[PDB]
């Protein structure tokens, strides 16, 4: 089956720097969009969604358009204390009637030095 790996446990960045949050899929089946959230529960916050939405200070590292692609890493600009937390990379499934969570990475703890 598809496994979602985020190799970093902790990422420590300086206030104002951009942080790279790294994530890899091992398969391409099942098809569906990757999404990034900060936090794990139903209180989680959408950080990025491949399918839909404009997330003005996130860039993808690779190009997610081209099928064959398996790098779901992201860059988030101008990190501040407000951005602190734990970022999960999350595979969704299918589509109809809605996208359904399938698999999630272990999580990358982002923080800021003072």
């Amino acid at each position: 089956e598809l496994q979602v790996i985020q190799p970093d446990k902790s990422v420590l960045v300086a206030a104002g720097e951009t942080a790279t949050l790294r994530c890899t899929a091992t398969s391409l089946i099942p098809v569906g969009p990757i999404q990034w959230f900060r936090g794990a529960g139903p209180g989680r916050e959408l950080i990025y969604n491949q399918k839909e939405g404009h997330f003005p200070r996130v860039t993808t590292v690779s190009d997610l358009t081209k099928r064959n692609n398996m790098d779901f890493s992201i860059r988030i600009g101008a990190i501040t204390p407000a951005d602190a937390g734990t970022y999960y990379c999350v595979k969704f499934r299918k589509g109809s009637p809605d996208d359904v969570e399938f698999k999630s990475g272990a999580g990358t703890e982002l923080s800021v030095r003072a």
């Epitope: 529960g41 989680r44 916050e45 959408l46 404009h54 003005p56």
Partner: antibody
């Protein structure tokens, strides 16, 4: 372009309930956190509540806690504010507002719906 | 919570002159400062975000400057249509949804 259009306001009696709705278009409603922000006659703007993208995560100013419920419908692109046990100091123009990012400034404001509470 | 001191409370500017509004944070807010305009009896509109960037559609008469704790909004060639209240909003710390006290701008005579 992005449009935020509130409705459901008017005159209500103290102790009545009232549902504001904000109809959203010109963007991907499900990808943003949404807020309600109110303004009493001649006061500063007062943040009332916020909601997640997914709908399961909700914060509320302490002046409305226990009495106000925020919720949303991603299918229909609509924000709600349920307001129970209303009283006279809840009289204001209530605006819906979009965030740029989940932890950022307000991108867009609604037209705003007036809510008068009076016996 | 970061304290945002907007100042002065009211500012009078004669028609055509520059108007200079200040907002000051209790502790550093980096670049993450946004300015809104609310004309009487309308909703607010975003003018400036990221301390210095104009929003889409906004006039070049409105400009933002500063970093850290001290910020400015500058209105170049003041028209009667700029009579309004202006609020600052920081989003460097969680939570973003607090405002300064606002600064009312009125035409000096």
């Amino acid at each position: 372009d992005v449009q935020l259009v509130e409705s459901g306001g008017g005159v209500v009696r103290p102790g009545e309930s009232l549902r504001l709705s904000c109809a959203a278009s010109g963007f991907s409603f499900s990808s943003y956190a949404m807020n309600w922000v109110r303004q009493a006659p001649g006061e500063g703007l007062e943040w009332v509540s916020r909601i997640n993208s997914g709908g399961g995560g909700t914060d509320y100013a302490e002046s409305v806690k226990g009495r106000f419920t925020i919720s949303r419908d991603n299918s229909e692109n609509t924000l709600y504010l349920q307001m129970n046990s209303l009283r006279a100091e809840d009289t204001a123009v209530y605006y819906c507002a979009k965030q740029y990012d989940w932890n950022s400034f307000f991108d867009y404001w609604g037209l705003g719906a007036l809510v008068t509470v009076s016996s | 919570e970061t304290v945002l001191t907007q100042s002065p409370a009211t500012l009078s500017v004669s028609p055509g002159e520059r108007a200079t509004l200040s907002c000051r944070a209790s502790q550093t807010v980096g670049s993450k400062l946004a300015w809104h305009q609310q004309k009487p009896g309308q909703a607010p509109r975003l003018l400036i975000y990221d301390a210095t960037n104009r929003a889409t559609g906004i006039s070049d008469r409105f400009s933002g400057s500063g970093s850290g704790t001290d910020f400015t909004l500058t209105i170049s060639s003041l028209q009667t249509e700029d009579s309004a209240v202006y609020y600052c909003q920081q989003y460097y710390y969680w939570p973003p949804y607090r405002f300064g006290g606002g600064t009312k701008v009125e035409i000096k005579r």
